């Protein structure tokens, strides 16, 4: 007996046509590439449905939207286009990272194809969309590697932050939604079910710095116990040889994320001036302090 909010599916079906690309699928959502029959322009639609577990979620769909259009001015978090809806779902028309997860970055077999130069830059960006989401009271709670895209692989392109479907507020509850993302992502505070803090999202960063640059996952074990151990513990492989390839600096950066009390987590504005991210583009002319006059 639910009256439909968003633009009519008669509509999306007379704008658009999907293509043949299934960009993703989880229990509740579907992403599918679609095109503008006027433009030509490419998009990702993402299917999500009300209902979910025997629960209503419009409200939470409402409030992740609320989310994406309040970022629309931040350019390293997805934006959202248009929005539909159908009997059973909520249709985002969102803006397509043609590049796909930055977990493609993470595996041994492109290791080869990204530099420190690409890494550095790729951890600065995904700061500043950090950055831009806490300063507005956003905590994501589920940037796992899958959770953030590019806009080009050849060449490398820009980071995309998705998936808001489990943001909160600073200082909301800890109970099942947060407990339930994917087990080597998720931060100590989250296992002690601790109040929502920034520093869970910042966590989830040195688990990021950590995967492009060792191509290993650092918590995950034979099986969820371990995994679950590993975060309580912080039991971190930084062997000589998981690291023979990585700088000190980035060391650091990671060193100083993955730790047990959240509070001593640097911020994101904090993390953005870390040593390790401070690189001159060599084709500028440098001014140094030593003026010619
Ligand atoms: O899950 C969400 O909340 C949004 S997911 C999404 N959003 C916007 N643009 C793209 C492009 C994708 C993409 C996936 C895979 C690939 C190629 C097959 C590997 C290329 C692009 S997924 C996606």
Redesign the pocket.
């Known amino acids: 007996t639910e009256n439909l909010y968003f633009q009519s599916m008669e509509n999306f079906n007379n704008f658009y046509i999907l293509t043949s ?1 299934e ?2 699928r ?1 229990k509740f ?1 579907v ?1 599918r ?1 679609c095109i503008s029959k006027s433009t030509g322009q490419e ?2 639609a ?1 299917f999500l449905k009300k209902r979910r577990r025997g629960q209503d979620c419009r409200a939470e769909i409402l409030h992740e939207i609320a989310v994406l259009e309040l970022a629309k001015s931040c350019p390293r978090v ?1 934006n959202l286009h248009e929005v539909y809806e159908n009997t059973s779902e909520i249709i ?1 028309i ?8 930055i977990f ?1 970055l993470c595996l041994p077999e492109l290791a080869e194809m990204v530099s420190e130069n690409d890494v550095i830059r790729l951890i600065k960006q995904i700061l500043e969309g950090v950055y831009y989401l806490h300063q507005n009271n956003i905590v994501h709670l589920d940037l796992k590697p899958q ?1 953030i ?1 590019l806009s080009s692989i050849y060449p490398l392109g820009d980071i ?1 932050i ?4 489990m943001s909160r507020k600073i200082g909301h509850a800890c109970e099942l939604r947060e407990i339930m993302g994917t087990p080597e992502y998720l931060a100590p505070e989250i296992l002690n079910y601790d109040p929502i803090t920034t520093a869970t999202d910042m966590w989830n960063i040195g688990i990021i710095a950590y995967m492009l640059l060792t191509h290993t996952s650092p918590f995950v074990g034979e099986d969820n116990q371990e995994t679950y151990l590993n975060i309580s513990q912080v039991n971190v492989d930084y062997s000589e040889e998981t690291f023979s390839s990585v700088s000190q600096l980035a060391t650091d950066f990671i060193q100083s994320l993955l730790v047990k009390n959240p509070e001593k987590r640097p911020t994101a504005e904090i993390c953005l001036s870390h040593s390790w991210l401070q690189q001159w583009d060599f084709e500028n002319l440098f001014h140094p302090e030593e003026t010619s006059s």
């Open positions: 690309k960009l993703g989880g959502a992403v590439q998009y990702a993402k997805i985002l969102l803006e397509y990272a043609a590049g796909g997860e493609s959770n895209l995309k998705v998936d808001f479907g």
